């Protein structure tokens, strides 16, 4: 629907994906159709980035949620600085938060089981503020993203 560009829905998508990466999906009714489609395509992107940029990703130490947030904001800002928005770029936002939570799990100085909820929050903040209008104009998650990325 059109309200799926609001923060709450995006936050749930970002949290769903981190729980997917961390292998702790919550035993509710299950992730939404949107999330189920997003998890497969974002993970495929994530594993390709971690491979080709392995040596690159070993030069930064995500020791805290603050380092993850500034690193996320910095990298994402430069990715979208040309003003272009598309579903592929939005997918890479989720892929990158998955890269960050994996590094946090290993390197976080004081690990906290709620940390991935803080990551999901500033991920959703970025998506809403920088792509929310574009998402709505292109059908939202249900009528835009899912229609283009769901199985043939």
């Amino acid at each position: 629907g059109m309200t799926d560009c609001e923060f709450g829905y995006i936050y749930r998508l970002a949290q769903d994906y981190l729980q997917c990466v961390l292998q702790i999906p919550q035993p509710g009714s299950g992730p939404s159709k949107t999330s189920r489609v997003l998890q497969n395509v974002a993970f495929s992107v994530q594993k390709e980035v971690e491979k080709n940029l392995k040596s690159c990703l070993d030069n930064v130490n995500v020791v805290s949620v603050d380092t993850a947030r500034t690193l996320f904001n910095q990298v994402m800002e430069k990715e979208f600085e040309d003003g272009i928005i598309n579903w592929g770029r939005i997918v890479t936002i989720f892929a990158f938060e998955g890269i960050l939570i994996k590094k946090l799990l290993r390197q976080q100085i004081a690990p906290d089981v709620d940390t991935y909820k803080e990551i999901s929050y500033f991920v959703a903040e970025f998506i809403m503020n920088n792509t929310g209008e574009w998402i709505r104009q292109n059908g939202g998650w249900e009528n835009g993203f899912v229609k283009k990325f769901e199985p043939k």
């Binding site: 890479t92 990158f96 283009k148 043939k152």
Partner: peptide, 23 residues
């Protein structure tokens, strides 16, 4: 330098997978 390499590769792979043209 690091943050530019990450931003570049993400932008590349983004516009790459973006050609999921369906519906």
């Amino acid at each position: 330098s690091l943050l530019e390499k990450l931003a570049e590769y993400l932008r590349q792979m983004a516009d790459e997978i973006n050609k999921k043209y369906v519906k």
